[PDB]
Amino acid sequence: MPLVYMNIIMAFAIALAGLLMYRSHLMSSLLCLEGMMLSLFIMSTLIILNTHFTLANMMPIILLVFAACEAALGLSLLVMVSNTYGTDYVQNLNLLQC
Amino acid sequence: KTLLHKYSDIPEGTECHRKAYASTSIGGATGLIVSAYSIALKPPASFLEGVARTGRYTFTSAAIGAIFGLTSCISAQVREKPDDPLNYFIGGCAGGLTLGARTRSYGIGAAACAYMGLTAALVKMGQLEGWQVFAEPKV
Amino acid sequence: MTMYIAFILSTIFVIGFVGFSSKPSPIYGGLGLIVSGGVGCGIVLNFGGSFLGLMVFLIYLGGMLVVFGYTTAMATEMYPEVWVSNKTVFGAFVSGLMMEFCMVYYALKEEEVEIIFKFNGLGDWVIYDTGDSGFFSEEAMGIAALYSYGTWLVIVTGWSLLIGVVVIMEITRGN
Amino acid sequence: MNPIIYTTLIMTVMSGTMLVMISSHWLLIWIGFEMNLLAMIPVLMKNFNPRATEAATKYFLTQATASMMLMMAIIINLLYSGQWTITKMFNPVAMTMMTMALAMKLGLSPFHFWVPEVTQGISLQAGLLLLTWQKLAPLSVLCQISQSINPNLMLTMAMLSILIGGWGGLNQTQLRKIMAYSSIAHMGWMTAVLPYNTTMTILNLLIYITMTLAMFMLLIHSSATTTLSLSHTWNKMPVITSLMMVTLLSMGGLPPLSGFMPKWMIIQEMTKNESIIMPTLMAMTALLNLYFYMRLAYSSSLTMFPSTNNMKMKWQFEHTKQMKLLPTMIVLSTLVLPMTPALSSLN
Amino acid sequence: MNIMLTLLTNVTLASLLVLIAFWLPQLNAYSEKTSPYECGFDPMGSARLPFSMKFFLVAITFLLFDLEIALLLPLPWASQTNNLKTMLTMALFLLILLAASLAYEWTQKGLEWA
Amino acid sequence: PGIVELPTLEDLKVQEVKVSSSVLKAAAHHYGAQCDKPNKEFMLCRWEEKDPRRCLEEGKLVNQCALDFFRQIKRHCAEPFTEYWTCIDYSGLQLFRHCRKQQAKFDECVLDKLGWVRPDLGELSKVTKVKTDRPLPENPYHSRARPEPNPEAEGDLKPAKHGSRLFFWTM
Amino acid sequence: PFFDVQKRLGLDLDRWMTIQSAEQPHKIPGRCHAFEKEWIECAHGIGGIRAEKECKIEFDDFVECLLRQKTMKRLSAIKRQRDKLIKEGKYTPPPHHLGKEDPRP
Amino acid sequence: TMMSGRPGRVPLQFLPNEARSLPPPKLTDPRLVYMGFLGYCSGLIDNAIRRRPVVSAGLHRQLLYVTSFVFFGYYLLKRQDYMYALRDHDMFAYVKSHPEDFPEKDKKTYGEILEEFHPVR
């Protein structure tokens, strides 16, 4: 594996760590999800282009489509959370416990 | 897995110091994992408090491992019976007593002695008889 | 230096990720995401994926626009945080940059680094193929096969998007 | 939510599961999981409460992380093999990541923290959908990739699931959280046999789905979300609480009830592979689930708790809506043991 | 590399212009001159407080439609296939699904604001 | 594993067709019409063999035929061809459209002096037959022996000896 | 629970993109079409358990074509040896490698 | 796992044509009778849940319950028998094809064999 694969997988690892380590805002963690999706797009595109898997050059675009679907879902939930609590802070998702 | 290989490689009833060191390393690793989970799930108020909790858990685990290994190896040497599970039982009860001392409770000490000693004896028996906690699928 | 454009861009990508992952205010994390998207476009174009890279840049440019508006609306704070406004954000940023620098120098110097997989420090130019695609853009022809070969993917994705519009409407109804 | 929209969303969830269970391409399986999440999120919030929104957010975050990890595993397997087909996974790190993602989707500990909260937040019907239908796709994917799975990781997750599902339920007075923890324990039972025999996992899944459907439909019929609310049911509808007691006993695994057969066959299959300590520990830890099941039974049917005066009005009226499949679900959950040899049909 | 050179040249020109603007002129910066502008009177609150977006739904739908923009851009090369029947059917399927989504949001009062 | 048997430098030395891309494109149609046989033989060799080494001699023949074609052009139609390929060179895309008149001059001269007729649209793209004395490669992929398939479908089904034979069930 | 509805109904919903050696637009070959074809043909109808060891040579060749780990390692070793020789002063790159000769067309 | 990848298995087929060679389950099979009993219990539970007369109300509904359960049970029993018969067929075929792995053992009478006697004292 060339080093670019190393860097892109490192980017995915960093984004995963960011998402799993929340601070206050939910928007930042949704941005970490989008970053993970971008890293996955780059990895898939590099693999499919280096291996000349022609009929697999569409898989990144479908991955991006469902990444944007996920992003839309996240924002639509964040809007309701903000409406019900006034902020996007994760500490307010505390009613359900255990 | 290297720590487990280190503990296993030293022959039973021999090189008691190295066996105790391996047991201490294993206890320290387990304590570190427990401390990480405790810090995550139950947040510590301060970084110093988190360090204190990590040190307490790690030292308790390391003391348990060191006492278990030291007592088991010394008993194996003195009795001169290497494969007897009773040595592991004695080591486990000593570890439970150490846990009770660290927790400053007699009841914890006694319950830990019974359960931990029995578990250690069972582990030694599994070594001798080839018991598999995780079995490779063979059907 | 132009022999390793890909590596420089990938390092910039990782730095942007360490920027938006340390979680500054969503504005500067969006800045990081935009920069990383541009750099990823650069990498994919260097490997021959002009359409894909440009598409990622275009889609993330629009996506981060809605994120910016949402931030100014919901994820807003009186004193928005930069990577040097809190010890936690700066700690994360510095740790991420240091971790990169560590692996970067490690792999560049050592012939074969192995963090979780095995990586070879030889430039990316080595792996490239010597064949010719003739009068064709393989990426374009493959991406166009979504309509001739990927009828099933088109069906699934179109349904997913329509149901996504419906889902957003329902999730934001708010009773 | 307009009933047409609700039907469409439920069909979308089922179609995502069907895509997962029908596709030979990893991309399409991941697409099915994504469609399941997209459709499910609005379904969980059909009744709008702050709790419903919190549960939807938690579920979305956990499932999105699981999906991203699964996609990374797929991409790594593609990088090291060049194959998109669902088959043996040729890279161990990808296999570990995929197992983690699928366990998180299934709620296997140490990824169980979301299940009780989500179950409590959502309604009983959304809870039924979450705890019966959603489990199908990850278990199907695990069954297809069982050979590649490292037995140690799956078995560790299963044992932790059993232990935690047993422990947490002891402390619960909310019926939905109790169901969530019991689901965790039963899922731990199902994944234990995945490395050894997949048909046993399928059989356990079917028995568990039948029992969970019966329990959730009985709770919906009684309109109870807490133990005290269920306690009153004896005054209004005794038969419901009696059948609940029978179903709880089956869930505990007591012979001769149908809950016994899955544990029985899992123990047999594990023993055939020389696994003795693991089955013994799993069977013993199942007693805690039995304990909280028995406590619920004591509250509901075996002992008659105090009622309220206003129940006299409820006596006059009768339940308007009928759940057609409930009696057959009860009968299957409780009286199917004499028919175990038929476990070769799904075989 | 030509694109990189052009980008560098343009960015360097802009940065040089900024430098010349911030260093050639004379400055007498004082607090009142650098205070925020609120049409002569002083601001009441901050400009970093939340600013309600009355068109949030349209923005999320914009993301979802930019996805379709991405999916439709390959069409120019798609018309070069031999299975023009299937290509045309799927392209019209995607465009009709986008139209359906727009119609649904419109009829459900989703394109309206507030 | 084994050493790769790369051919020697001397064997791969050949006379080279040192003409620019515009010159080749100007004569491309007549070149394909005239030199089809050797070029098709080399193509068949390349595609069947799947080894560049195996087909070196046919490539040498291809180069020789191209040289002969250009030599005949130089002998009989040099100036009109020079004007033609000069015209194509100016266009960045080397389009044929801009140079139709000079192409007409070249085609008329070639038809008169050498008798060559330009192939019509859709002719050089036709799959052609090639008669070859070179044997068809038996194992062009150098594949190993395929693993033997499992035994299958022994015979008829009879009921289980004693039923399920599951614990206590008698049926 | 992989209900092979595609095989039952003869529908190629997604199998067309499953492998790199399948039909692709304009017959554009994959970068490892030969190795993938050989591996698929070797491991056909013998089961995964058998194919994992009876076609291991084919699979290793396919993986080498995909990743070029061994080829990259050999190239890196050759470059390291060449650089060490240059440092020692006992090696001199040929003029054609240095650009003193016109490469073959 | 196991039989899932058996060669020649048509996907999503409940009963292969090969099963027809096996004897059909008898309509008086105890297992089918138990399935009918389950159907009857289902009808009784339905009546109890809807607060109808348990044993007399809805005879048509109880008949439908019993008939549906027996109808599905017949095919379920047929498939179970087919699967067990396939298992036995494959097992015997494998034993025949691998004689070394399943060697015939010399039979020694108890007189020849020595088994230690442990006195119960």
CSV table of C-alpha atoms in Angstrom, one decimal, chain B residues 34-129:
chain,number,residue,atom,x,y,z
B,34,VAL,CA,-11.1,-0.9,33.8
B,35,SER,CA,-9.9,2.6,34.6
B,36,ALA,CA,-10.5,3.7,31.0
B,37,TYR,CA,-14.0,2.4,31.0
B,38,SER,CA,-14.7,3.9,34.4
B,39,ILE,CA,-13.4,7.3,33.2
B,40,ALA,CA,-15.5,7.2,30.1
B,41,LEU,CA,-18.8,6.0,31.6
B,42,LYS,CA,-18.5,7.8,34.9
B,43,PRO,CA,-16.7,11.0,34.2
B,44,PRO,CA,-14.1,12.3,36.6
B,45,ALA,CA,-14.5,15.8,37.8
B,46,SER,CA,-10.8,16.8,37.2
B,47,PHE,CA,-7.8,15.4,35.3
B,48,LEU,CA,-6.1,14.9,38.7
B,49,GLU,CA,-9.2,13.0,39.9
B,50,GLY,CA,-9.1,10.8,36.8
B,51,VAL,CA,-5.4,10.2,37.3
B,52,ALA,CA,-6.1,9.3,41.0
B,53,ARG,CA,-8.8,6.8,40.0
B,54,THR,CA,-6.6,5.3,37.3
B,55,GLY,CA,-3.8,4.9,39.8
B,56,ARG,CA,-6.0,3.3,42.4
B,57,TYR,CA,-7.6,0.8,40.0
B,58,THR,CA,-4.2,0.0,38.4
B,59,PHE,CA,-2.4,-0.5,41.7
B,60,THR,CA,-5.2,-2.7,43.0
B,61,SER,CA,-5.1,-4.9,39.9
B,62,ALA,CA,-1.3,-5.0,39.9
B,63,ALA,CA,-1.1,-5.9,43.6
B,64,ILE,CA,-3.6,-8.6,43.0
B,65,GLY,CA,-1.6,-10.0,40.1
B,66,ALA,CA,1.7,-9.7,41.9
B,67,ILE,CA,0.4,-11.4,45.0
B,68,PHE,CA,-1.3,-14.2,43.0
B,69,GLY,CA,1.9,-14.9,41.0
B,70,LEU,CA,4.2,-14.7,43.9
B,71,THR,CA,2.2,-16.9,46.2
B,72,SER,CA,1.4,-19.4,43.5
B,73,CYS,CA,5.0,-19.8,42.4
B,74,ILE,CA,6.3,-19.9,46.0
B,75,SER,CA,3.8,-22.5,47.0
B,76,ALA,CA,4.6,-24.6,43.9
B,77,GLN,CA,8.3,-24.4,44.8
B,78,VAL,CA,7.9,-25.2,48.5
B,79,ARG,CA,5.4,-28.0,48.0
B,80,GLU,CA,7.4,-29.0,45.0
B,81,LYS,CA,4.2,-30.1,43.2
B,82,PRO,CA,4.2,-28.0,40.0
B,83,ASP,CA,0.9,-29.0,38.4
B,84,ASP,CA,-1.4,-29.0,41.5
B,85,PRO,CA,-4.3,-26.6,41.3
B,86,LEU,CA,-4.1,-26.0,45.0
B,87,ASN,CA,-1.2,-23.6,44.4
B,88,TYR,CA,-3.4,-21.5,42.1
B,89,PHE,CA,-6.2,-21.6,44.7
B,90,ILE,CA,-3.8,-20.3,47.3
B,91,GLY,CA,-2.7,-17.6,45.0
B,92,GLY,CA,-6.2,-16.6,44.2
B,93,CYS,CA,-7.3,-16.4,47.8
B,94,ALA,CA,-4.2,-14.3,48.5
B,95,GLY,CA,-5.3,-12.0,45.6
B,96,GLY,CA,-8.8,-11.8,47.1
B,97,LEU,CA,-7.3,-10.8,50.5
B,98,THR,CA,-5.3,-8.1,48.8
B,99,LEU,CA,-8.4,-6.8,47.1
B,100,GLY,CA,-10.1,-6.7,50.5
B,101,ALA,CA,-7.2,-4.8,52.0
B,102,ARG,CA,-7.2,-2.3,49.2
B,103,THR,CA,-11.0,-1.9,49.6
B,104,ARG,CA,-10.5,-1.9,53.4
B,105,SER,CA,-13.3,-4.4,53.9
B,106,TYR,CA,-13.2,-7.8,55.4
B,107,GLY,CA,-16.3,-9.1,53.6
B,108,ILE,CA,-14.9,-8.1,50.2
B,109,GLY,CA,-11.7,-9.9,51.2
B,110,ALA,CA,-13.4,-13.1,52.2
B,111,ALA,CA,-15.8,-13.3,49.2
B,112,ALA,CA,-13.0,-12.4,46.9
B,113,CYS,CA,-10.8,-15.1,48.4
B,114,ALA,CA,-13.4,-17.8,47.9
B,115,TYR,CA,-14.5,-16.8,44.4
B,116,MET,CA,-11.1,-15.8,43.0
B,117,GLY,CA,-9.3,-18.8,44.4
B,118,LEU,CA,-11.9,-21.1,43.0
B,119,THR,CA,-11.6,-19.4,39.6
B,120,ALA,CA,-7.8,-19.7,39.6
B,121,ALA,CA,-8.0,-23.4,40.5
B,122,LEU,CA,-10.4,-23.9,37.7
B,123,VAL,CA,-8.0,-22.1,35.3
B,124,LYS,CA,-5.2,-24.3,36.4
B,125,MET,CA,-7.4,-27.4,35.9
B,126,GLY,CA,-8.2,-26.1,32.4
B,127,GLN,CA,-4.5,-25.8,31.7
B,128,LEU,CA,-3.9,-29.3,32.8
B,129,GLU,CA,-7.0,-30.9,31.1
